[PDB]
């Protein structure tokens, strides 16, 4: 059922697995993510960014998720506001029925980030909603999370989970040269905070997905994601929520491109989007197995 984020992530923290947190912008993405969760017996974080909420309407974002949760009541699901940028944004999400919100003030000075995050936490905790915040700057290897800052930040804000920057970045172009992450830094943050941790920019760009996209005439020149083995290492190091969006998009649109390329007379939407859903579903299912949330219901 729909539950507070911390219920799902505290279990993952206790047992040492990671739970994929998958973004959606419409019904097709949402359906595919739920079907994957049902097929792999996995709990789900379902995420909507502020841009996604504007596209859908916050009423429809929550409404669709509630319908899906009733379709699959045995699956623990948290509905999460990804990259909330203001107190008001988080407040609106809480009011609409989100069960988890991220307040992202990572680019503010430490004390400003802490003050804003603390303000969101007070509001969200009053409403039974969990909160994520961020420290460090998301970019490839000051910059990265400062573990002693994290220790103080978490203690003083009472935030439920923290996203520490350890060398990932958003999007399909995460690394020029060989992938590298600061796992020692991650482990120190985990020791000092002892809460669930969140990895942003965690898409892998898997080989089969890249191949699907390129085969359909797509251009992914230069793209590189987080290696599977690095995602596993991150979970061993204390990551329990693994934000994944780009992988889902590439897989889905590859299938849309393929149909568009091949059958010029095709305009039945379902013929584009059924294959697109299937590819997205399969990406999510494999990722659930990789991170270890498979079979945790």
Ligand X SMILES: O=C(COP(=O)(O)O)N(O)CCCCO
Answer yes or no: are the C-beta atoms of 240 and 13 closer than 8 Å. Answer: yes
Q: Segment near ligand X (CB under 6 A), from 111-119, 237-245, 270-278, 282-290?
A: 237-245
Instruction: By CB under 5 A, name the one of 80, 185, 190, 200 that touches Zn ion.
Output: 200
Name, in order, each residue with C-beta under 8 angstroms of 252's C-beta and a sequence gap of 6 or more.
Answer: 28, 29, 32, 276, 277, 279, 280
Q: Are strands 239-244 and 197-199 parallel, antiparallel or unpaired?
A: parallel
Answer yes or no: are the C-beta atoms of 201 and 222 closer than 8 Å. Answer: no
Task: Tell me which DSSP letter residue 217 carries.
Answer: T
Residue 263 is a catalytic residue: no
Footprint (CB under 5 A) of Na ion, residues 228-247: none
Residue 243 interacts with ligand X (CB under 6 A): yes or no: yes
Q: Compute the least distance from the CB of residue 28 to a second copy, in Å.
A: 6
Q: Given the complex with Zn ion, which of 108 and 191 has the nearer CB atom?
A: 108
Residue 64 interacts with a second copy (CB under 8 A): yes or no: yes
Q: Compute the least distance from the CB of residue 246 to ligand X, in Å.
A: 3
Which of Cl ion, ligand X, a second copy, none sits in contact with 269, Cβ below 5 to 8 A by type?
a second copy
Exposure pattern of 282-296 as b/e (b: 16+ CB <10 Å)?
Answer: bbbbbbbebbbbbeb
3-state secondary structure of 12: helix
Residue 134, φ and ψ in degrees, nearest 5: -135, 140
Report how many helices (DSSP H) and strands (DSSP E) the chain contains, helices first. 12, 8
Q: Given the complex with ligand X, which of 22 and 34 has the nearer CB atom?
A: 22
Which of Cl ion, a second copy, ligand X, none sits in contact with 203, Cβ below 5 to 8 A by type?
ligand X
Name, in order, each residue with C-beta under 8 angstroms of 91's C-beta and a sequence gap of 6 or more.
Answer: 123
Residue 176 interacts with a second copy (CB under 8 A): yes or no: no
For residue 189, which of 133, 105, 129, 244 has the smallest C-alpha distance?
Answer: 133
Footprint (CB under 5 A) of Na ion, residues 86-115: 102
Over the window 154 to 193, marking each residue x when it contacts ligand X by CB under 6 A and - when it does not, the resulting string is ----------------xx----------------------
Q: Segment near a second copy (CB under 8 A), from 127-135, 142-150, 230-238, 256-264?
A: 256-264
- Can you give the binding site for Na ion, defined by CB under 5 A? 82, 102
Residues with catalytic roles: 82
- Can you give the binding site for ligand X, defined by CB under 6 A? 23, 49, 82-83, 170-171, 200-203, 243-246
């Amino acid at each position: 059922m729909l539950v507070k984020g911390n219920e799902i992530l505290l279990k993952a923290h206790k047992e040492g697995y990671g739970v994929g947190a998958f973004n959606f912008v419409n019904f097709e993405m949402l359906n595919a993510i739920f079907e994957a969760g049902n097929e792999e017996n996995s709990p789900l974080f379902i995420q909507a960014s502020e841009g996604a909420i504007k596209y859908m309407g916050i009423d429809m974002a929550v409404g669709m998720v509630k319908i899906m949760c009733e379709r699959y009541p045995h699956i623990p699901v948290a509905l999460h506001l990804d990259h909330g940028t203001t107190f008001e944004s988080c407040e609106k999400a809480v009011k609409a029925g989100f069960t988890s919100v991220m307040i992202d003030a990572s680019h503010h000075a430490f004390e400003e980030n802490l003050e804003l995050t603390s303000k969101v936490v007070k509001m969200a905790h009053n409403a039974g909603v969990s909160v994520e915040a961020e420290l460090g700057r998301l970019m490839g290897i000051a910059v990265l999370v400062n573990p002693k800052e994290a220790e103080q930040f978490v203690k003083e804000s009472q935030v439920d989970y923290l996203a520490p920057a350890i060398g990932t970045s958003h999007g399909a172009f995460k690394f020029k040269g060989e992938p590298k992450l600061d796992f020692e830094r991650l482990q120190e943050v985990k020791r000092l905070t002892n809460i669930p941790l969140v990895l942003h920019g965690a898409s892998a760009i898997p080989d089969n997905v890249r191949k699907s996209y390129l085969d359909a005439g797509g251009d992914l020149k230069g793209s590189k994601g987080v290696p599977f083995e690095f995602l596993q290492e991150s979970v061993k190091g204390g990551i329990n929520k693994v934000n994944t969006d780009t992988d889902l998009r590439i897989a889905f649109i590859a299938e849309v491109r393929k149909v568009a390329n091949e059958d010029k007379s095709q305009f039945d939407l379902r013929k584009f989007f059924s294959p697109a859903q299937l590819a997205l579903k399969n990406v999510v299912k494999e990722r659930m197995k990789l991170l270890g949330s498979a079979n945790k219901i």
